[PDB]
Every structure is written in C-alpha cells, then in structure tokens.
Design brief:
The complex is a heterodimer of chains A (51) and B (185). Chain A has 51 residues and is of the alpha+beta class. Chain A has one helix at 29-38; strands at residues 11-12, 18-20, 25-26, 45-48. In chain A, a hairpin with a 4-residue loop joins strand 2 (18-20) and strand 3 (25-26). By secondary structure, chain B is mainly β. The chains are: A alpha+beta (51), B mainly beta (185). Chain A: The record marks 13-14 as: Reactive bond 3 for chymotrypsin, elastase, proteases A and B, and subtilisin.
Amino acid sequence: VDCSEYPKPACTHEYRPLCGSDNKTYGNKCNFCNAVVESNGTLTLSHFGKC
Amino acid sequence: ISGGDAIYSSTGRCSLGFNVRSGSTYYFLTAGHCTDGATTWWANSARTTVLGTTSGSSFPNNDYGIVRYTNTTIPKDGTVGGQDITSAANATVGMAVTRRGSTTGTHSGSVTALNATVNYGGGDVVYGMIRTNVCAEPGDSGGPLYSGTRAIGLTSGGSGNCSSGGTTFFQPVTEALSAYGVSVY
C-alpha cells in the first residue's frame, strides 16, 4: 500500500481492513492513507487485516 | 435480510441497500464500487450462506449495482431494519434523511446539496450525487438512505466519521430503479 496520491477529499466506504502502527484498524486503504497524511507521515502499516 | 444488513463479497464487506423486484424476480441494490469485480455475495463472514450473484454494476460515473438472489429460503424483507419502505422519491435540499449501515448502524441528518461531483481519484469520478451531513464509515457503503417510508439513495462515500461528524454522498436510488426496471416493495 502506497499513499502517494494522498490525501483525497473523499473515500468510498467498503470494508477491507488494514492495521496501523497506532494499533487502530483502518477500514480501507483510502481511510488509512488519509490518516497517514494527517499524521504528517508518522503513521505506518503494521499488517493487513484487523489489528 | 433487509436494508442496512452486512453483505460479503470475496473482497470485503458492504451493506445491502434495498430489496427490490421485477415480476417475480428478486434482487438487492448496493453500491457500484462494491459490485465492481464481485461475482458472488454471502450473508456472513464465514461465507456459508449465499445470497446471490452480481447482475449489474455501474461505477464510476454512477455508483449503483444490483445482485440477483439465488438463495431461495432467506427472507427478503422490503424494509430497512425494522422500517417499512413503500416507495421511492427524489431528494430535495433540506429533506430530513436517515441512513443505515452494517458498521455504524442508523444515523440521521439532512440533504445539503444535489448534483454533486465526487472525485475518488485515479479517474474514479461520480456525478449527480446527493450531499448530506450524515456520517458514514467503512462497511456502510451501499446502505440505504431513506426518509420515513421513502427510499432515497445508496451510500457511496465521503469524509469524516461518526464521532467527529462528516459529509456523506449518496447515489439517487430513482436512477438505479429506472436503469434496472425494478421497484421497491
């Protein structure tokens, strides 16, 4: 998962979870990538699926 | 199974929009981005209870899809959770609406704009969307937007979340009903 094309003003709401380094399950890649951006690049991917 | 309930494809989870029919053929509507590349749909994460197979998908540009029921025993309620749905209508600015999704459940708000263009990036642009101040989160895609007993739209996407508040865009259901020649019941 690469978040280069982010941020994005909107995301679709399908559920395909990712686990972030903050131990939060992100609902999908768009959701996760927008958070990474908001974190000024400090949040990273722990693994695929729920935390 | 009814509007707002979880539905699973091979790739993830979305929500059922509305149960609809044509003649004696039953289907359900959901988001086009959910039906895109999906063939079979199940009622559970274990994938042991089949629902049916994708019969149509329109995304991007629009955001609706339709799934034909192949499961003969599962109840196909013409409701949204407990709520009866008896017709479909066009959204209007200021209209009080309610959405139900498999992740966040039921949330209410109002229609704040019509004919909105939403750019999901990578060339995925959808047009003619209903804008609202209702929140939604991953898993809620395709769920119904209704107003009393009136079917209004299908959850597409947006920003924010239910804790802080957000903006959610919906695909007008009238357009989907016309495209497939089906109707709510």
